[PDB]
């Protein structure tokens, strides 16, 4: 059980050489679409790459590089896409990935600036009557709604497709209160949130892969889909030992690199799988004291 192995590690103070194991056992694959020099542009951080066999695929002839990954979890039926914060030169191919892999959702777990620095491009519309047009691939996206709890935020987009006048609803859920390198308030407000989009129906298997980011794409985004696909995992057995959470994350790492960049998101993802444990063992009302502690009202 990992709430016993939480406490042996805790205990231990040892979250600082299980991380290190992890970052010797994980996966190295090929990353040279990223490193061509006509793509250096296209990649927020030099260090931070998709791997070739995993990348997405923009359908666009000139240039088909985006700095994005597919994280396909067999046997969860779960799809993730992360990717890195758009830059003031990818908002385009953004959501001309959005449009082509047939997402419903788009999870962003930081905000546009934090420590001082700009960590994103405002890449949707802040009021309804303000649309933004992306000229280089040719879609529209207006604000329709937004929601504003007390630390996220969703909104309620439309795109538009200006070349075949198509349209979709997509849910941007913005979680407004997690720093960079670090790790939310409590289990209780990242959980509430991961609920949220979940009842959205955005990670539905009827929907493209929700596509999620922070600025790299790697550390709160790899946390969001860790809690996810191990809270699944111990749904579909019904047995929270089964769950071996190491084994996840490096499954997960054969196909983006870095996924988890502290040993205190390692620790958090711990926490909030475990108090997720709660619900998925049939304790309903965990949910409604989740939405009392995170204080969204
Ligand atoms: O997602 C996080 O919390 C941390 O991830 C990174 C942020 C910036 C740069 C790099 Cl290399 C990683």
Not at 97 to 110: A, I, P
Not at 116 to 132: D, N, R, T, V
Not at 222 to 229: E, I, K, P, R, S
Request: aromatic share 10%.
């Amino acid at each position: 059980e990992m709430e016993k192995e939480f406490e042996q590690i805790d205990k231990s103070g040892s979250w600082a050489a299980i991380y290190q194991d992890i970052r010797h056992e994980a996966s190295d694959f090929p990353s040279r679409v990223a490193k061509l020099p006509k793509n250096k542009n296209r990649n927020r951080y030099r260090d931070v790459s998709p791997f070739d066999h995993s990348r997405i695929k923009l359908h666009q002839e000139d240039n088909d590089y985006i700095n994005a990954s597919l994280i396909k979890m067999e046997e969860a039926q779960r799809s993730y896409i992360l990717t890195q914060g758009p830059l003031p030169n990818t908002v385009g191919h953004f959501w001309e990935m959005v449009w082509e892999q047939k997402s419903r959702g788009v999870v962003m777990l930081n905000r546009v600036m934090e420590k001082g620095s700009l960590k994103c491009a405002q890449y949707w519309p802040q009021k309804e009557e303000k649309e933004m047009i992306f000229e280089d691939t040719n879609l529209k996206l207006t604000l329709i709604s937004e929601d504003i709890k007390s630390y996220y935020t969703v909104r309620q987009l439309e795109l538009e497709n200006l070349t075949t006048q198509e349209t979709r609803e997509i849910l941007h859920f913005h979680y407004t209160t997690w720093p960079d390198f670090g790790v939310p308030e409590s289990p209780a407000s990242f959980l509430n949130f991961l609920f949220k989009v979940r009842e959205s129906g955005s990670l539905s298997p009827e929907h493209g892969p929700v596509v999620v980011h922070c600025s790299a794409g790697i550390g709160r985004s790899g946390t969001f889909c860790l809690a996810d696909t191990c809270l699944l995992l111990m749904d579909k057995r019904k047995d929270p030992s089964s769950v071996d959470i190491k084994k996840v994350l490096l499954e997960m790492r054969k196909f983006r690199m870095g996924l988890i960049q502290t040993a205190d998101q390692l620790r958090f993802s711990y926490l909030a799988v475990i108090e997720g444990a709660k619900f998925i063992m049939g304790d309903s009302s965990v949910q409604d004291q989740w939405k009392e502690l995170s204080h969204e009202d």
